[PDB]
Amino acid sequence: MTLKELYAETRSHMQKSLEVLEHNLAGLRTGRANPALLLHLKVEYYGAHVPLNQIATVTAPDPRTLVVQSWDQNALKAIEKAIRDSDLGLNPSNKGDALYINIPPLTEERRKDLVRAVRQYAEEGRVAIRNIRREALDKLKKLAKELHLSEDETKRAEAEIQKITDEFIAKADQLAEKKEQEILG
Amino acid sequence: GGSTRNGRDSEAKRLGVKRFGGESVLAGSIIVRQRGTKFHAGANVGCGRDHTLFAKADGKVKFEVKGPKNRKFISIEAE
RNA sequence: GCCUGGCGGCCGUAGCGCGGUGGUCCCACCUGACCCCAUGCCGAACUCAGAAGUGAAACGCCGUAGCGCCGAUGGUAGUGUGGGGUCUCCCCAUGCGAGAGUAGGGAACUGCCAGGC
RNA sequence: GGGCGUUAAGUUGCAGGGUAUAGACCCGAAACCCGGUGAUCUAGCCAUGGGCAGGUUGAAGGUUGGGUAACACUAACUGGAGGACCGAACCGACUAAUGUUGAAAAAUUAGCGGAUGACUUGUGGCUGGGGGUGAAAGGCCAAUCAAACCGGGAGAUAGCUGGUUCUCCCCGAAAGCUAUUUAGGUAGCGCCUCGUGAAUUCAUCUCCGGGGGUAGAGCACUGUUUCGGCAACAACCCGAUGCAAACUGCGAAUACCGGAGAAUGUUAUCACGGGAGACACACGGCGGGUGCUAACGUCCGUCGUGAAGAGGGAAACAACCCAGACCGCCAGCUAAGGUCCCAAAGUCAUGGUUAAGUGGGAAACGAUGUGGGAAGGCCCAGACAGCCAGGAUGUUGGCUUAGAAGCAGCCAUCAUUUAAAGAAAGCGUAAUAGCUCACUGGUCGAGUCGGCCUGCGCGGAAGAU
RNA sequence: CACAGGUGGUCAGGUAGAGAAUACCAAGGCGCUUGAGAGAACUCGGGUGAAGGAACUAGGCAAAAUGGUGCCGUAACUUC
RNA sequence: GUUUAUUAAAAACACAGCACUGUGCAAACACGAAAGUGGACGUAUACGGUGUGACGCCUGCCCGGUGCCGGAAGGUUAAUUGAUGGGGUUAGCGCAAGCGAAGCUCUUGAUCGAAGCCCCGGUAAACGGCGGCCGUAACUAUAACGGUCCUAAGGUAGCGAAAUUCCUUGUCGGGUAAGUUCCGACCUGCACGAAUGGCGUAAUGAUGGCCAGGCUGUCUCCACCCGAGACUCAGUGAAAUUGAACUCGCUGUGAAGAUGCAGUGUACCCGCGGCAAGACGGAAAGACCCCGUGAACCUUUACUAUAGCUUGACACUGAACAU
RNA sequence: CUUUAAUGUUUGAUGUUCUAACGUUGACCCGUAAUCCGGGUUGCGGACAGUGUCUGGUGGGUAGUUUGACUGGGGCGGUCUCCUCCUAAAGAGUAACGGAGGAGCACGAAGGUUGGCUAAUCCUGGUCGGACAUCAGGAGGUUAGUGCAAUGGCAUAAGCCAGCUUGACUGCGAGCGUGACGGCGCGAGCAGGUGCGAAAGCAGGUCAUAGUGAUCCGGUGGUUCUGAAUGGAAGGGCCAUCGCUCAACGGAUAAAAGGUACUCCGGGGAUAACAGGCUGAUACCGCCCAAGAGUUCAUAUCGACGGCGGUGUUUGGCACCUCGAUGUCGGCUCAUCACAUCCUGGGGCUGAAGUAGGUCCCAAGGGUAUGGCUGUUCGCCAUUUAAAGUGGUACGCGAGCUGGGUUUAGAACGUCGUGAGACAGUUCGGUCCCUAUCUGCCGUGGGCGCUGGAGAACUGAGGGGGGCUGCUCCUAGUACGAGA
Ligand SMILES: [Mg+2]
Ligand SMILES: [Mg+2]
Ligand SMILES: [Mg+2]
Ligand SMILES: [Mg+2]
Ligand SMILES: [Mg+2]
Ligand SMILES: [Mg+2]
Ligand SMILES: [Mg+2]
Ligand SMILES: [Mg+2]
Ligand SMILES: [Mg+2]
Ligand SMILES: [Mg+2]
Ligand SMILES: [Mg+2]
Ligand SMILES: [Mg+2]
Ligand SMILES: [Mg+2]
Ligand SMILES: [Mg+2]
Ligand SMILES: [Mg+2]
Ligand SMILES: [Mg+2]
Ligand SMILES: [Mg+2]
Ligand SMILES: [Mg+2]
Ligand SMILES: [Mg+2]
Ligand SMILES: [Mg+2]
Ligand SMILES: [Mg+2]
Ligand SMILES: [Mg+2]
Ligand SMILES: [Mg+2]
Ligand SMILES: [Mg+2]
Ligand SMILES: [Mg+2]
Ligand SMILES: [Mg+2]
Ligand SMILES: [Mg+2]
Ligand SMILES: [Mg+2]
Ligand SMILES: [Mg+2]
Ligand SMILES: [Mg+2]
Ligand SMILES: [Mg+2]
Ligand SMILES: [Mg+2]
Ligand SMILES: [Mg+2]
Ligand SMILES: [Mg+2]
Ligand SMILES: [Mg+2]
Ligand SMILES: [Mg+2]
Ligand SMILES: [Mg+2]
Ligand SMILES: [Mg+2]
Ligand SMILES: [Mg+2]
Ligand SMILES: [Mg+2]
Ligand SMILES: [Mg+2]
Ligand SMILES: [Mg+2]
Ligand SMILES: [Mg+2]
Ligand SMILES: [Mg+2]
Ligand SMILES: [Mg+2]
Ligand SMILES: [Mg+2]
Ligand SMILES: [Mg+2]
Ligand SMILES: [Mg+2]
Ligand SMILES: [Mg+2]
Ligand SMILES: [Mg+2]
Ligand SMILES: [Mg+2]
Ligand SMILES: [Mg+2]
Ligand SMILES: [Mg+2]
Ligand SMILES: [Mg+2]
């Protein structure tokens, strides 16, 4: 357990929490202009809901539509009916290897819920980080007494801790800001 | 931090290079921690506990090299 | 002078390897072993009394350069004093001048005493 | 045997150097202790006197009517409470400006708070210093208070700061080592001075005798390192290549130690004794640690200079270059550095470079700037540049891709036709097309191309009066 | 200091006024021991300011504003 | 109401109220070497000390540690008394070796010994303390909630981004055109919390913060005017400062920020009214920082002592009895 | 005499009763037409209380003091003595808060001597024996071992085994080495006695270099040294020896922690903070190579891996200048310069239709926002503008203004500490001086000089001032454009 090993722990945990916030953000029907929402969509094929990672394929021709480029000449129907069982539950067409899923703007009601939500997750993340930073400092005190650090070495370590902390805070801000700038656009 | 400390003077070396006045028993070489660096030979020998090349009877110093495998060897012939 | 043993000089161009070789002179093995003496077991070693045999081993010679080793001339690196350019580096004058590598050398030489021809 | 002694004159004055005890060269603390003087300021309290214009609110209690069994209760009136209300005097002091060598060592002006009360005020009294008093701030105790003022111990102590007075002559440091409640102080040693002794003592050069493991180099060793070779990913080993402060099978210069010799050097040397100062160094050169081979950085070794050295040079510049100032000169030669004018001395001589004010700031990298030199390729079987024309077929190569046809990408990159003709160099199309290229043939008539060794220049080059 | 400070008690006229406030006066006492000009910047103390109205500033600091008697009338809350 | 007379009037001191605790009176306590005095010509509904600070609703858990209260059986322990053994000396003994009584001495400490401490119990409106790993969850998650390990015991009510929150301008709502402040919320309380009081509270306040109406020269942006200076004349007549001055700019140099050095630019000699960029301007041997084997006052389970409080022994201090 | 008694008697331990010391701040009497004091009487208490001397406890109530130094300011952290290697420039020796490790002991054998032995590792072949035991050979050659670090050393072994032993002896010591000194080290040989060996000979501790504490004050043993009239004795000396993480290890005491923002004195710019300076790692700006993206296409725009600079400009380093005083941040007022230019002006390329942009080159004339929040600078936000430039000027500007942030003294909260107090935490409150001599600016005069003296009007060397820009319209709804 050293100053650096402490900093690392800080970066890691804070990164985890950021990821939590990450896909947490993605778990929200946005302007669905990007495939950041469908990226998950598992493709039940071969007795397994094998996600589109090793099964079918998809993408968005333009901000107002996506295309399910099903690799299997039969999976084209899979993802189709798979469009359901999710916040999607849409009914695309069926033309060629790639399906089609338009991408329009939502209602003002959801505009509300989606906004309060976006910023909500933002704060949630911030808090998680704070607690993490806090702990990072506690450990730092323990080191001071252990490694027989000097007031200068310990205070230096403190400053560094803060640095890592703020950085992550920013990450959360920016992310929330994009998912938001869009979902609020 | 650990790094520091060090022994003191501990001279040890040649104090009677080549022929000298070589009194009853000067030193000729106090390079302790040795036997081969300087070997006890000739009128001189001793080689005290601290491997100090004694040097007996008065005379000059030689500083030779004899016997199998180099081997410095010091001694003090007459003058 | 040829061969051998003991004791030294000098310690690798004196060593190592490989091939040949010498014998009941000397040496070596070798024989015998209750004993002197010896084995943390062994007569292997030390130790003693000594054939028979053989130079097989070791040893000593001789040849051989494959591996060591010695090793320049020249050039190169460095460097003392004086001077000069210069980013921590280097140049010139002038003394000293390697190491490595190359040429090449190289299969020791030598004294005392003793014993065989 | 070894230590300390033994054929050294001492002693007493006088003058001086030093030391010890003393104020000990002089001036200076904050403080500590002893005895007194202070409650005419202020803080508490004690005794005895004084003060509070005006205006407001209206408690308790009481009377009467109502009411009750009686009490509660109720309402008018009466009544006059209060650290009660507004506001002068009186007390106080929240805000601003002005004053700040003031009118004043805390005030003036305009606002502000209390104003029958824990109120305010006069006179006199009582608590005294480690003590008092304190609605508590260490506040007040006579413009003084985390321990008053006055006199004394007293010339406290001051390893700190400052200051130290007439002249001339000689020598001349140190800024280090080792100890140190030591680190800006001391002490022994070192270095200075003075005296007395003593030797070819000491130094330089030459030569002779030494141990050396630094520079360098090298890679057997200790580690580190590649590249190849005999390992159901690789060490070991072998050959080829490097690296090292804590590697060395090698190895200087050179320093140092000793011996001999000549010359030179007012003994420079060693010993003892009187007096020291000095133990903050700085810069530059060289070898290094550290730092960033950063610092007018820092820590060592060593040499030089400044310190403690003026003069000349580097514009001006302790340290760098030259050079060591006894004094006077309206005399000469030089060192470093300079010789067109400020400004002493060549607009000097010969030959060559540069053309940028380079000279007179700055890198990677960039470029037909330019001087010199050795050489190589193509070339009248026409090089070289320009100009004309050509540049095909299998084939849109296979795969891939919606499409990939020379020219997204991967693989292949052959063959045929020839004077030549890449399964293609760039642009381009959705893909083709199309355009240009390599190349080849002709025209053209004499040189052409880029590498290298070396001299000077150009770009890269933005900062504040 | 011939110092804009400090100092206890007594007395208490007229008009207006609640009044020992305040303003103007009586009795009485004074003009404050350098003056004379000028009519600058700037400082000090004041008066008035178009339109705006706290934009000032750390802060409405300072200013400006309010101001009496009688009557009408007056919220949350309340320990009434 | 009180306070730092002379930069702090306050959220500080005080306060009525509350609680604890000591005190039986020749009180506790305080001034005093003592006499004596205050407390009080009072007497537990009294007086002193301590803390909290109207009032309302309240005031949780911990006695391990320190303090205080009670116990005091046992262990340890002062002075005091001095058993006991040892030594010095020497009469005598002895040709001598040594041994040695008594006395005197030097030493040794049996033994007797109170409070205190240890020990046993209590006590928090006494000084004080009120959990760590982290235990088990809508993708991961995350771990407030709370398992388990250990505490003297692990923060109850109430409150919470607060006079307390580091990240911090946390997040949300309100107000604004725009609000790091402000108000209302959330709770992730770095590091609130119950008389070193918790949460409220009408009234009060030259108290801190925020807002509004009015009002304005506070400001946009300053203008005019009335007076006291400033300016002029006459009289009187200071100050700090001061090595010497023949007292320019720049760029460079330099103990590293130049009127004085180098180069250069500029510049006829001297006043008066104004302004403050420089003379590292004036004033105070820097108050911050370090140093001195300097000083002071303050703190404490630093050391060494000491007043006071308290223990026992002997003395003033005597007579009997029971055990 | 020896156990347990009974009376006696003594003498302690308690505990009762008494009076007669002693107390009385109960009552009365006299001195005395006094509350004091003294005497007397009586009552209560009573050998207790209390006081003196001695003694255990308690004792910041009070007092005197201690509470180290080094240190790239101090503090925090670390360190302090000894041994080993490098640093250390081939003699000795050398510094750093330089790079790496160790010691505070261990052995009666792990010492002495005599005699004898010699490894590690690999290969091969062998019951259980395999990676790795023991055995046999071969290769190998100090790569093993060394009580413990590192260096040097070691085969004649110092490495290993055994026999016998006590030289780990006593007194001395030629001569050296190394220290400022105290002191430390090496030492042949001599004398006495040992041991081991046939003998020569070897042995005065360990292969060597760490394993340590001076003095004083005492303890113990020995000694006929001394012993205060004499003989003894106590004591002293001498010899041997014991007692100190005095480790801050040359050891100030036997005995020693803190606070100050209530502070104070003597000193330092020998030494921190501000600003200047040196430096520029960091920072910012620029350039080099060009894999990539740019549908295609390195270089319109950007650019990986890496490379080179410029500025003085951030974060820093150094401690050269000021500590016999150079006032901090922000605001206000007033500025001045730079160019790495925000706007306006002139251009190149464009993935430039136009309109608008992008990037680079040139250009410093002029211009370059009001508010909300906060002390802010900045920043976020509202709303403007042609634009709301970056930077230097002691982070320009207090002998010009402010005093909001920030370091005095008051006070409180959270937190730390037993506590005084403390915080690069917060919170409410909290005196800002100078009449300008010199330079320099802004104005304004007085002299003289311009060569006879005057009144005028000019010339113009030079110096200064000013240099901003929107929108609308016409061109032209044209060029351009699918239109818009
Ligand atoms: Mg009142
Ligand atoms: Mg009033
Ligand atoms: Mg009075
Ligand atoms: Mg006073
Ligand atoms: Mg005295
Ligand atoms: Mg004095
Ligand atoms: Mg000491
Ligand atoms: Mg080298
Ligand atoms: Mg040397
Ligand atoms: Mg010193
Ligand atoms: Mg020094
Ligand atoms: Mg030095
Ligand atoms: Mg220096
Ligand atoms: Mg000097
Ligand atoms: Mg130039
Ligand atoms: Mg007058
Ligand atoms: Mg107006
Ligand atoms: Mg405002
Ligand atoms: Mg403003
Ligand atoms: Mg006001
Ligand atoms: Mg007014
Ligand atoms: Mg009040
Ligand atoms: Mg005050
Ligand atoms: Mg005040
Ligand atoms: Mg209180
Ligand atoms: Mg409680
Ligand atoms: Mg407002
Ligand atoms: Mg709130
Ligand atoms: Mg609290
Ligand atoms: Mg309270
Ligand atoms: Mg005047
Ligand atoms: Mg006058
Ligand atoms: Mg200058
Ligand atoms: Mg002025
Ligand atoms: Mg000054
Ligand atoms: Mg001073
Ligand atoms: Mg004290
Ligand atoms: Mg004293
Ligand atoms: Mg120190
Ligand atoms: Mg050396
Ligand atoms: Mg085997
Ligand atoms: Mg050893
Ligand atoms: Mg020491
Ligand atoms: Mg205080
Ligand atoms: Mg001072
Ligand atoms: Mg300095
Ligand atoms: Mg500085
Ligand atoms: Mg300066
Ligand atoms: Mg430009
Ligand atoms: Mg702004
Ligand atoms: Mg400034
Ligand atoms: Mg001022
Ligand atoms: Mg302030
Ligand atoms: Mg305070």
Return the domain boundaries, chain A.
3-31+107-185, 32-106
* Chain Cα centroid distance, residue A109: 24
Q: Are B30 and B12 in contact (CB under 8 A)?
A: yes
A181: CA distance to ligand 51 center in Å? 43
Question: Per the structure block, which two tokens stand in for A103?
Answer: 């991408």
A115: CA distance to ligand 28 center in Å? 25
Contact partners, residue A15, CB within 8 Å, separation at least 6: A168
> Which bases of strand F have any atom within 7 Å of the beta carbon of a protein residue?
139-143, 166-168, 170-172, 188, 190
Phi, psi (deg, nearest 5) at residue B68: -40, 135
Q: Does residue B69 reach within 7 angstroms of strand C, measured from its CB?
A: yes
**First-residue to last-residue Cα distance in chain A:** 47
CATH no. of A3-31+107-185 = 1.10.132.20
Could you give the count of Cα atoms lying within 13 Å of A167 in the half-sphere of its Cβ? 12
Location of structure tokens 């006045």: B21
Phi, psi (deg, nearest 5) at residue B53: -55, 95
* Chain Cα centroid distance, residue B52: 6
Do A3-31+107-185 and A32-106 show the same overall fold? Answer: no
Q: Are B43 and B35 in contact (CB under 8 A)?
A: no
* Resolution, expressed in angstroms to one decimal: 3.3
Solving technique = X-ray
B35: left (phi > 0), else alpha (psi -120 to 50), else beta? alpha
Exposure pattern of B67-76 as b/e (b: 16+ CB <10 Å)?
Answer: eeeeebbbbb
A55: CA distance to ligand 31 center in Å? 104
Rounded-to-integer distance, Cα A148 and Cα A58, Å: 57
Rounded-to-integer distance, Cα A39 and Cα A16, Å: 20
Location of structure tokens 């490694």: A147
The CATH number, out of the four listed (3.90.1150.10, 3.40.50.720, 3.40.50.2000, 3.30.1360.40), of the domain defined by the range A32-106:
3.30.1360.40
Question: Per the structure block, which two tokens stand in for A119?
Answer: 């910023």
Rounded-to-integer distance, Cα B78 and Cα B64, Å: 15
> Which bases of strand C have any atom within 7 Å of the beta carbon of a protein residue?
9-12
